Amino acid sequence: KEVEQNSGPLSVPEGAIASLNCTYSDRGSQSFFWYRQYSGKSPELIMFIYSNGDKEDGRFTAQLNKASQYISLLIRDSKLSDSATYLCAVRTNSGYALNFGKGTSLLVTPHIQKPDPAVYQLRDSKSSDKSVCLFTDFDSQTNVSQSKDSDVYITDKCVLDMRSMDFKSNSAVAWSNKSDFACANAFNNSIIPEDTFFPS
Amino acid sequence: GSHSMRYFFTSVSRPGRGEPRFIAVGYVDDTQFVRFDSDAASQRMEPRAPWIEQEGPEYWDGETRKVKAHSQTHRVDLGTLRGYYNQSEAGSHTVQRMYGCDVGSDWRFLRGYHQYAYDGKDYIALKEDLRSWTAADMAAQTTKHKWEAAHVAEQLRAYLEGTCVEWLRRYLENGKETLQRTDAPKTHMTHHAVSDHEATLRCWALSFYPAEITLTWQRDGEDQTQDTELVETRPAGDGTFQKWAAVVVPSGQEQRYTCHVQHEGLPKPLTLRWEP
Amino acid sequence: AGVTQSPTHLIKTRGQQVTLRCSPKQGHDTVSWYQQALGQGPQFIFQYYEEEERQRGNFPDRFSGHQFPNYSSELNVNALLLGDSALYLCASSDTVSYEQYFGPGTRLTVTEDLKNVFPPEVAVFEPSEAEISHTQKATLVCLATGFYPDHVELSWWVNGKEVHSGVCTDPQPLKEQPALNDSRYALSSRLRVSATFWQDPRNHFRCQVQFYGLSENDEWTQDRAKPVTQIVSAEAWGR
Amino acid sequence: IQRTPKIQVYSRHPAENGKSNFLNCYVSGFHPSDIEVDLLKNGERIEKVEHSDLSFSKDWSFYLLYYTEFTPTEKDEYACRVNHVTLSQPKIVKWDRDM
Amino acid sequence: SLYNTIATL
């Protein structure tokens, strides 16, 4: 493949400089673009660069270096809404097609002021034909693991902003239909904080 | 010394027709290497040198699609201009475009250029850096503002410094046997009596490459210039060039006159005299 | 005024044909088509200008295009393979800057057989009474499961109004049978509110999943309900 | 704007009566592009006349080369004829070994 | 080699 970039995810703390690269091989390469794509949406052009050097645009700086054949993009002052996949594309002088990278996924991590790691158990409103475990209020530096068990489903981490008392939280959910699953065992392939709260 | 890659494009509207005639040629120095003609059956960029035939079908497909884009771009421009000048459909009008690279003896970028003409007068052109445009008139001034918003110049500049140069550097290597050759002029002089006390001395330079050449007459060392007929340097047809310079002198004073030939090929300048 | 495309989603069976539409942005006249496989870069299919295929990528005969005299475009694919499942992006440009701008896409899922299509079952789990006493906050989770394909929009509604504060939804679904191409999918979301706001027994919570499924066109011979485009929701009441 | 042609008729390599060569008519300096150019072999037009691809100079004015295989004889008069919008009268230029 | 993104007036 022509244009190469790493899949990531890159993890960046909120407020801090994100940094993406992209290298290409064809020396015919003449014009360069960064597109941003949110989950389940189209790519949107966030920057074009045509000349060697830097180009700053608000929080975004792109850096092209044709001799070494890279284009970087730096996002200063990373916001949560910057979490997205960043694709880079080159157009060579031989034609009109854009040639794209895989995309690098960027997760911007929020800082939790008072972490309070806890695994809660939740019943279903109607039957008891599943039940669920909610690992929540852990700090952003905890990696949650997928399950070793074929019939136990564990979601990735995900961050909510209770905007009105401006509070952010990490959570992941685990569930099974199995006789012999419960919230004590659910996040055991994850490295849990270990003063984590476990109530009945 | 220096070398250049220069592309030339001509579109002429045919009101008694649909489509404009369109012609593109590519030179390296004084040597043409490609052409496209709308009226040639082909509908592709054709090679016109041995060292370009070397390129694969990837290359040719690209040059064909880009030349087609130029053709189509001139098509719409002919229309747009006709409208900017409130000119009827009955007239035949012309656009011309010239662009390319120069490099130094050290094959590094020296200079670039891109210029556009309408009916043989400058319309709009890149300045000597490649950041702004010279607009001839008020029509061109709207074209300028429009191209400024779209970063037309920046994209052009990236090609002229850069990829145009990289390609020139490549053609000079692959065609080294022809493009980096010099061929010194073969020379002679002819003496033909005009009238009864007066004779024409004509001094010839033939079979030289490149086309750059100086041909001067001197009288006792003083350089005739008002008194010399000098013809434009002309193609032989075999990838070499020709010039001559003539002067009319009083008969018996022929010994006082000498022709001076300066050319990249010659180690020291030649000096021809009228010798039987 | 922006680039438009349709349809936004599609399910086609293998070997059928499809025909996607794209209208460029007002003021643009060239359209390029691209295929985006999941977790991957858009691949150039071809570009159309002045009603002609100006340039083509690495896509075979069975992908044909058309551009009409208004500058809009059609991408027809026939002999669909499962491999053609992708986000089909259309991009427009002028001939001045040549900047390419993408539309929303058409999400094509090609299955071998339409009995692989399943809507979601949806469930809401009510916050733990431990969480409420320990943090003064209450997290409901929602769980949409057993659906195929991954064309869904999950939303939370409180007292009949859609909410965004306090929500987060897995940006990607989980596969239930990870080895299968036609595996079914699951997805969770959370809504988090103050314990006091949940403890109020007037307040009512609905988790909603929009599923994109079969059209009216499509033939259906199974006993189970035709898994058409539909919304499946689940709810909870406070205490 | 109109500018008037410049004509030069000459052989490719030095001429020799009764030896194989090419006869060139080189026309330059002109605008607009539209041009009639004929090589002649005794006043009547030569059939097999080829030409260069149209191009132009930094001043915008066009140039073409018209050429043909030929074999000069002492007797036979070769020449070039050129017509253009800038001229009331078509211009003939005889080929001469020492132009 | 010829330029790709030649602009209209």
Residue numbers in the entry:
A (entry chain D): 2 to 201
B (entry chain A): 1 to 276
C (entry chain E): 2 to 240
D (entry chain B): 1 to 99
E (entry chain C): 1 to 9
What did the published study say regarding this structure?
Comparison of these structures with the 868 TCR in complex with the A2–SLYNTVATL index sequence showed that the 868 TCR engaged all the antigens in a similar conformation and with a similar interaction network. Similar experiments, performed by examining the relative binding of 868 TCR to A2–peptide by SPR over a time course at 37°C, showed that both A2–SLYNTVATL and A2–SLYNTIATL had a half-life of >7 h.
The majority of these studies have focussed on the immunodominant response through the p17 HIV Gag-derived epitope SL9 (amino acids 77–85, sequence SLYNTVATL) (6–23). We add to the existing data by providing the first ever TCR–pMHC structures in this exemplar model of how HIV evades engagement by host TCRs.
